[PDB]
């Protein structure tokens, strides 16, 4: 029955898969933040993170 609980926890995590979304603080660099977010998404896709 350990397998059941472990599977439940790992499934709950895997359902909550998330991606980095870089948010700018100074507000003067929103475009660099969006570009860095897209680069992070590209790297996560290629590396299959």
């Amino acid at each position: 029955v350990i397998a059941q609980s472990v599977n439940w926890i790992i499934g709950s995590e895997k359902r909550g898969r998330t991606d980095f979304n870089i948010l700018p603080r100074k507000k003067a660099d929103a475009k660099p933040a969006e570009a860095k977010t897209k680069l992070l998404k590209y790297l996560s896709d290629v590396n299959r993170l």
Binding site: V1, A3, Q4, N7, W8, I10, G11, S12, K14, R15
Partner: peptide, 22 residues
Amino acid sequence: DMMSRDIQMLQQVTVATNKLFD
């Protein structure tokens, strides 16, 4: 009674199956 109990344990042992789907 042993058969019934074993069947119940088979029931106990979607979310649990997510790793195969992934």
